């Protein structure tokens, strides 16, 4: 248990350092290959889908809605970089939320 916990610490740190993966962090890559062999692709269609997944990476954002304007309903969406863009700022958008101990530059 001791060693398994010390790795379970580094198994958190490397994850939050970004370049390390897990089951629901690579399960989408299992899905990538799944549908690439399901609905066949050509190379340039692959580059189009890759630019699609780079536009759904650093700007795609959650809380997507749809109409059934008479009736509308909204629920949350898959991850991105922009959900980090919004979780780094207390979800406030104003990066000066840390009113506590911090050095200042004037």
């Amino acid at each position: 248990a001791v060693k398994k916990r010390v790795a379970a610490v580094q198994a958190e740190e490397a994850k939050l350092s970004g370049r390390f993966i897990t089951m629901r962090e690579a399960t989408v890559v299992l899905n990538v290959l799944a549908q690439l062999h399901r609905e066949q692709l050509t190379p340039h269609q692959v580059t189009l889908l890759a630019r699609e997944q780079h536009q759904a990476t650093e700007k795609a954002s959650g809380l997507t809605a749809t109409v059934s304007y008479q009736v509308e309903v909204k629920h949350s969406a898959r991850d991105s970089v922009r959900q980090l863009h919004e979780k780094s700022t207390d979800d406030t958008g104003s990066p000066d939320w840390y009113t506590g101990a911090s050095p200042v530059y004037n």
Binding site: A1, K4, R5, A8, E12, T22, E25, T27, A60, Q83
Partner: protein, 39 residues
């Protein structure tokens, strides 16, 4: 995409010594002798 850093409040559940126990209990239940190689 599914960014790694985001799912964290679960990745310290591990390094919390509460889930260390709740999974080492399973590992100990599993280290025993078993007589079934497949289903």
């Amino acid at each position: 995409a599914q960014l790694p850093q985001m799912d964290w409040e679960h990745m310290s559940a591990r390094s919390s010594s509460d889930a260390i126990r709740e999974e080492m209990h399973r590992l100990v239940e599993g280290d025993a002798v078993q007589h079934q190689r497949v289903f």
